[PDB]
Design a protein around this ligand. Structure first.
Ligand code: ZN
Ligand code: ZN
Ligand code: ZN
Ligand code: ZN
Ligand code: ZN
Ligand code: ZN
Ligand code: ZN
Ligand code: ZN
Ligand code: ZN
Ligand code: ZN
Ligand code: ZN
Ligand code: ZN
Ligand code: ZN
Lengths: 258, 258
């Protein structure tokens, strides 16, 4: 039908329908820790997710999204490299077919098993739709997932995945607390970039956490049981839904830490 | 935030974002039975729905759709005005807030309480996506609903509507037999037209059945309990989701019957 992560509609081909794919501020990128220099003027990141109001979970054929009530400053991101206030709208993941791949961003070319993206939009622009049209419209907080101990806070998400196996399925998903998806340290890298999926708009201040979270082999396995396809179409397992690293070009990646 | 059937985003305004709304082959139309002349060269309609494989039912914020497995020539429409073979992909309805309105097509200006649309695409083009780009890409079989005796075959659909009350909700809907939604006679009118919702593409051969089906006041009342809005958004009842009759212009409506 349209773009995806397969042999013929995958990242390598997105440029055909989405010429910005070859743009100047594309994401993700490889974070080289020898050239991503500590910038002492970067403020600490302020994550306020205590009052986060989750609404639903859905399979859109590309990943699964947990969506939030973003009608108010309830769950917000502030500080770090950000001017003003960015509201949490949704989170989702990218993951691999094998533990050795799955993340979008890489660190010294190292790939993680998965990457969590918490998507926020700039309240200066009134709504998400207007925010995405601006170079400072979104802030995506990127968090690496490594295989290890189970993430207690992830368990509620994993539990409900059998009810959204196929494209277009959704379920009610209230009283989820996204704080349980964070690591201890909020040390980060940051750079100006893009959405990692079509339409690939260059509207994102990327904030990628240094510290990965630990998830269990079982939690990630449940991700890999999702389907790219709709119910009744041929089975195509939702795996390897990551875009590889793109050229940094004339951009600097700044580190919050030494 | 986009097109709909309300005061400010309704059919009267669709021309703003969708200039084809004022095009030459727009649907629906009023079927004037004094000018819609019997054409003895029209073949009888062949409806083959015996092997129809229904998949799911969903609320897309505009109507509810029952979708079908269209990977094979299993549920097809042939003959009548059609060249070749058209596959059933989905059906849906348009209805009113009151019994005296709701249909898209009208017959001598008479409005029915609701209208059923069975949507088929031309197998010559390989898939629906390619078919909609062609003037002969789709065939929509239009069936009027009048208030009267309950339609036994409609009951299974009505039953499951409480589980898809709001926008974005879907449910599994297998082993539905669409033959139960047909009248006895397959006498029809036909004319070249368009989708009655945005993007309003001019790709439809319309086949509208003369004989309405009878549904109960209770069956239609269940339709009117649906919501245009998503779960938790302010309630806007899914009623009066019809486009009024558009100008016929330089088109002829042909009747299969005398
Ligand atoms: Zn190319
Ligand atoms: Zn290096
Ligand atoms: Zn070095
Ligand atoms: Zn180096
Ligand atoms: Zn898509
Ligand atoms: Zn919102
Ligand atoms: Zn992402
Ligand atoms: Zn609910
Ligand atoms: Zn495929
Ligand atoms: Zn106007
Ligand atoms: Zn819509
Ligand atoms: Zn299909
Ligand atoms: Zn319709």
């Amino acid at each position: 039908h349209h773009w995806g992560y397969g042999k013929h509609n995958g990242p390598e081909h997105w440029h055909k329908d989405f010429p910005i794919a070859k743009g100047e501020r594309q994401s993700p990128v490889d974070i080289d820790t020898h050239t991503a220099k500590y910038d002492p003027s970067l403020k600490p990141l302020s994550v306020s997710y205590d009052q986060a109001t989750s609404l639903r979970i859905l399979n859109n054929g590309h990943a699964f999204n947990v969506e939030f009530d973003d009608s108010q400053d309830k769950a917000v991101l502030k500080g770090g490299p950000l001017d003003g206030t960015y509201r949490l709208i949704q989170f989702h993941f990218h993951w691999g077919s094998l533990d050795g791949q799955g993340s979008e961003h890489t660190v010294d070319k190292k790939k993680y098993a998965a990457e969590l993206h918490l998507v926020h939009w700039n309240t200066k622009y009134g709504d998400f739709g207007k925010a995405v049209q601006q170079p400072d419209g979104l802030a995506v907080l990127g968090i690496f997932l490594k295989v290890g101990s189970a993430k207690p806070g992830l368990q509620k998400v994993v539990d409900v995945l059998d009810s959204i196996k196929t494209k277009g399925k959704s379920a009610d998903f209230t009283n989820f607390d996204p704080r349980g998806l964070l690591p201890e340290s909020l040390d980060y890298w940051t750079y100006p970039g893009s959405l990692t999926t079509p339409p690939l708009l260059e509207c994102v201040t990327w904030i990628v956490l240094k510290e990965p979270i630990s998830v269990s082999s079982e939690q990630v396995l449940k991700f890999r049981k999702l389907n790219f396809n709709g119910e009744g179409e041929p089975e195509e397992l939702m795996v390897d839904n990551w875009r590889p690293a793109q050229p940094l070009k004339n951009r600097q990646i700044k580190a919050s830490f030494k």
